[PDB]
Amino acid sequence: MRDLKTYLSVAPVASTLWFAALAGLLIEINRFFPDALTFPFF
Amino acid sequence: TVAEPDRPLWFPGSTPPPWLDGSLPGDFGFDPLGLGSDPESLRWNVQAELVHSRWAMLGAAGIFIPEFLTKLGILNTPSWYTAGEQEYFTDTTTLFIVELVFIGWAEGRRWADILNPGCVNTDPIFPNNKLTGTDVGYPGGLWFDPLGWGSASPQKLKELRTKEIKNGRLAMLAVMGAWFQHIYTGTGPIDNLFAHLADPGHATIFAA
Amino acid sequence: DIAGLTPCKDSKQFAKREKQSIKKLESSLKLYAPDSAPALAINATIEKTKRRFDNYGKQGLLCGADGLPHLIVSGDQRHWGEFITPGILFLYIAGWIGWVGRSYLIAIRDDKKPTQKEIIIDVPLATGLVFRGFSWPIAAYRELLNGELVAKDV
Amino acid sequence: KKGEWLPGLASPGYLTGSLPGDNGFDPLGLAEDPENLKWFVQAELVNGRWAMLGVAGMLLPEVFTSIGIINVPKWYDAGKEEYFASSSTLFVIEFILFHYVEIRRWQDIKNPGSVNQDPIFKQYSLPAGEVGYPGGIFNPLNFAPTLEAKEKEIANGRLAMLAFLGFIIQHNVTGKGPFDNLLQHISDPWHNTIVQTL
Numbered sequence A: 001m002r003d004l005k006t007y008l009s010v011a012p013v014a015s016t017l018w019f020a021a022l023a024g025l026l027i028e029i030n031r032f033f034p035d036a037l038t039f040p041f042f
Numbered sequence B: 001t002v003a004e005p006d007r008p009l010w011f012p013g014s015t016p017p018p019w020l021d022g023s024l025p026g027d028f029g030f031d032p033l034g035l036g037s038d039p040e041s042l043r044w045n046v047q048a049e050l051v052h053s054r055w056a057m058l059g060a061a062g063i064f065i066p067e068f069l070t071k072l073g074i075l076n077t078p079s080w081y082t083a084g085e086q087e088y089f090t091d092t093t094t095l096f097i098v099e100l101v102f103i104g105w106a107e108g109r110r111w112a113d114i115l116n117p118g119c120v121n122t123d124p125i126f127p128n129n130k131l132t133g134t135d136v137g138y139p140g141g142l143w144f145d146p147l148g149w150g151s152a153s154p155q156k157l158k159e160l161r162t163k164e165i166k167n168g169r170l171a172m173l174a175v176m177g178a179w180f181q182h183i184y185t186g187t188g189p190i191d192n193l194f195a196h197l198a199d200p201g202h203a204t205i206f207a208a
Numbered sequence C: 001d002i003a004g005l006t007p008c009k010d011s012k013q014f015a016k017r018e019k020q021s022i023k024k025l026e027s028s029l030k031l032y033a034p035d036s037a038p039a040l041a042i043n044a045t046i047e048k049t050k051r052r053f054d055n056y057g058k059q060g061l062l063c064g065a066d067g068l069p070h071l072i073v074s075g076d077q078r079h080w081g082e083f084i085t086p087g088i089l090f091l092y093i094a095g096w097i098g099w100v101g102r103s104y105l106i107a108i109r110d111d112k113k114p115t116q117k118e119i120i121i122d123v124p125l126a127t128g129l130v131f132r133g134f135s136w137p138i139a140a141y142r143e144l145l146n147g148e149l150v151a152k153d154v
Numbered sequence D: 001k002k003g004e005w006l007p008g009l010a011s012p013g014y015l016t017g018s019l020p021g022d023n024g025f026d027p028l029g030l031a032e033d034p035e036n037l038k039w040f041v042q043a044e045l046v047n048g049r050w051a052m053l054g055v056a057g058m059l060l061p062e063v064f065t066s067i068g069i070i071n072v073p074k075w076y077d078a079g080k081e082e083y084f085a086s087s088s089t090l091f092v093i094e095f096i097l098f099h100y101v102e103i104r105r106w107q108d109i110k111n112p113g114s115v116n117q118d119p120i121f122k123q124y125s126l127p128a129g130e131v132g133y134p135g136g137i138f139n140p141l142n143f144a145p146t147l148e149a150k151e152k153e154i155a156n157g158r159l160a161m162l163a164f165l166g167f168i169i170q171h172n173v174t175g176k177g178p179f180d181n182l183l184q185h186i187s188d189p190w191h192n193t194i195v196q197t198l
């Protein structure tokens, strides 16, 4: 179980998870604020 | 810390795992995935199982008493599931914000004590007041143990605690069943129970 | 106007493009039903198109003879939303990433087997380091004044 | 116990309970260097004193004009009302005067005791206090600059900085005065939040 926690922190798995989460975040941002060319706030 | 070596075992004939000795209450040697083989893992998950069990028991009461006395014309509380929307004096987001502040304070206190035992015991405003329980997850003191009911010496405390953890496991399962029945069917749970009781041999899940 | 570009609210070409695309969509629509799921998807796309064109109208962008929006990055103040404020956002986030990475590298450099922590991350350590990037500008400044950012004697 | 901002969390080794206000709070490691800390203490004190003056002068005029004694504008408007002089003129005067006093403060932070004596009259110096706490003429009432009162000071300054944060975010999202905001939440509160504002 500890060995599993180590394995999950090996480079390919760590990067896979990091980028899947990042992808979900950017996807949802663009689903909420679509077609942005400028910063329309201030 | 009384390593009961031949306790009851969920799977008779097994040989329990080495990390499940017999000390913890409600021990029956069930960890086939080996999710508690490290002592710090085990104590953290002990806290998690405990607090889940108490939350589940509160919830099971709050459903199954009000529903059993709503079917009977005692009260008129709506469906526990549909009670998420029927609106109160305010809306829900603010209600959630005040709940958030209030309960998050308490959970941060419990956090501190889980990671450093007995280091938040007394009150800052009133230092004389002090929680009287000396274990993590069993706070005691006047607030959580004004009846003294809890603090005692083993064979007495150990049994009370095992009883707690078993009631809690059943309550977790109970509210899980309420959820999945009311998502499968479109009914109330007491209706499920009455229908199944009036036709057990036919009013099962295999009705679709 | 600036570089000869007139506003997308006042640009006839900008409008023509909008209505051409909209009714191409609606010509592709007139099928499958007036309520089926394909029709609902196509109508959602139509409404999204209208929202996009109107938002570009609100934000005061510059259009050319093509009828498409152009970008002014010179420093003029009517157009900071185009490049300079998203640029500040980018520089902040990028410095955040790089600062956290350099502090992790420095934190593990004294280990007996440093490569072991490069191919197998120490996740609790990184979890303690992620949030220093929030103030990476001030820290990097006081680290430059300290004579502490640049490895001496290299 | 020199005070904990988190009753479970341990102190940092670089905070010693020496300077007033020490409650052991610096999670982002900003002041794990003594020179950094010497600079940051000063910045905290001075920012806090400016926030104190600013928020008091922002809020008290509001209630004074709201129970009818004098008629003053709102802070987010007062820069527009015409005065006896341009706003450019006042800004330039302000720049020169703040230039002088801030470079004086600078040299005293860099080199305590070196900017004490009057540069015009060769008498009339200052006694040898500490940095961040110039007493003397700047302390006519000769109050005791004791440890108890420095903690008072920095606590008032911190709360004032938070009050400033509040005033500006409030004005930008709601659009009126902070006394407007307060009482209009006061009477009917359970429908007067930041939530209904958003």
Ligand code: CLA
Pocket (backbone or CB within 6 Å): C074, C075, C076, C077, C088, C091, C092, C095, C137, C140, C141
């Ligand atoms: C290639 C030549 C050139 C260059 C270099 C510039 C440069 C500039 N022009 Mg200009 N311009 C040019 C050509 C050029 N222009 C031409 C040919 C024209 C004719 C069309 C114009 C017409 C023009 C106009 C009309 C205006 C400008 C303006 C400006 C300034 C706007 C940017 C600014 O305000 O600073 C930057 C803005 C900031 C808020 C600074 C924040 C940046 C931070 C500090 C950096 C981030 C670093 C990191 C994140 C943190 C630091 C960490 C560190 C401690 C390690 C800028 C200095 C504007 C101006 O005058 O400025 C007021 C303006 O009005 N230009």
Ligand code: CLA
Pocket (backbone or CB within 6 Å): B010, B020, B024, B025, B026, B027, B028, B029, B030, B031, B034, B035, B036, B042, B045, B046, B048, B049, B052, B169, B172, B173, B176
């Ligand atoms: C969140 C619920 C939860 C948690 C945290 C625990 C935790 C624990 N249990 Mg327990 N258990 C539970 C629920 C839970 N249990 C329920 C509902 C039952 C009744 C079926 C049991 C019956 C049981 C027995 C008989 C025994 C334990 C034991 C233990 C301890 C052994 C260590 C371990 O299992 O590793 C860590 C635990 C976890 C990491 C939680 C696992 C969560 C997984 C991922 C859930 C997977 C989904 C699930 C299979 C399907 C859900 C759908 C379903 C509800 C319809 C440990 C502290 C042993 C003990 O000695 O107790 C002291 C023991 O003998 N449990």
Ligand SMILES: CC(/C=C/C=C(C)/C=C/[C@@]12O[C@]1(C)C[C@@H](O)CC2(C)C)=C\C=C\C=C(C)\C=C\C=C(C)\C=C\[C@@]12O[C@]1(C)C[C@@H](O)CC2(C)C
Pocket (backbone or CB within 6 Å): B030, B031, B032, B033, B034, B035, B052, B053, B055, B056, B057, B058, B059, B060, B061, B062, B063, B079, B080, B081, B083, B084, B171, B172, B173, B175, B176
């Ligand atoms: C089922 C469950 C957990 C089950 C976990 C299991 C089986 C894990 C088993 C194993 O891992 C072990 C242990 C060891 C491994 O080696 C082997 C496996 C097999 C992997 C938890 C439920 C836990 C369920 C909980 C905590 C329920 C709480 C409910 C509350 C608070 C109710 C709140 C309400 O208020 C609302 C929100 C609306 C109101 O109107 C009304 C009500 C409904 C009352």
Ligand SMILES: CC(/C=C/C=C(C)/C=C/[C@@]12O[C@]1(C)C[C@@H](O)CC2(C)C)=C\C=C\C=C(C)\C=C\C=C(C)\C=C\[C@@]12O[C@]1(C)C[C@@H](O)CC2(C)C
Pocket (backbone or CB within 6 Å): C135, D025, D026, D027, D028, D029, D030, D047, D050, D051, D053, D054, D055, D057, D058, D074, D075, D076, D078, D079, D160, D161, D162, D164, D165
């Ligand atoms: C200077 C200031 C305010 C000054 C205002 C003034 C003079 C107002 C002036 C005027 O009103 C008058 C009089 C008249 C009006 O007509 C015109 C104006 C012009 C309006 C506020 C500063 C206010 C400054 C603020 C809010 C500072 C916030 C700092 C924070 C939150 C830091 C927290 C942490 O840093 C720790 C402590 C430890 C780290 O490890 C972790 C983190 C979390 C990073």
Ligand SMILES: CC1=C(/C=C/C(C)=C/C=C/C(C)=C\C=C\C=C(C)\C=C\C=C(C)\C=C\C2=C(C)CCCC2(C)C)C(C)(C)CCC1
Pocket (backbone or CB within 6 Å): C073, C074, C075, C084, C094, C095, C098, C099, C102, C140
């Ligand atoms: C403004 C503007 C402009 C201009 C610009 C320019 C032209 C500038 C510049 C610039 C420059 C000329 C710069 C420089 C540089 C130099 C050097 C020398 C460097 C450096 C850096 C560093 C050193 C870094 C560090 C770090 C950090 C801090 C982060 C993370 C980590 C690291 C380490 C990476 C334009 C028009 C375009 C646009 C508009 C605006």
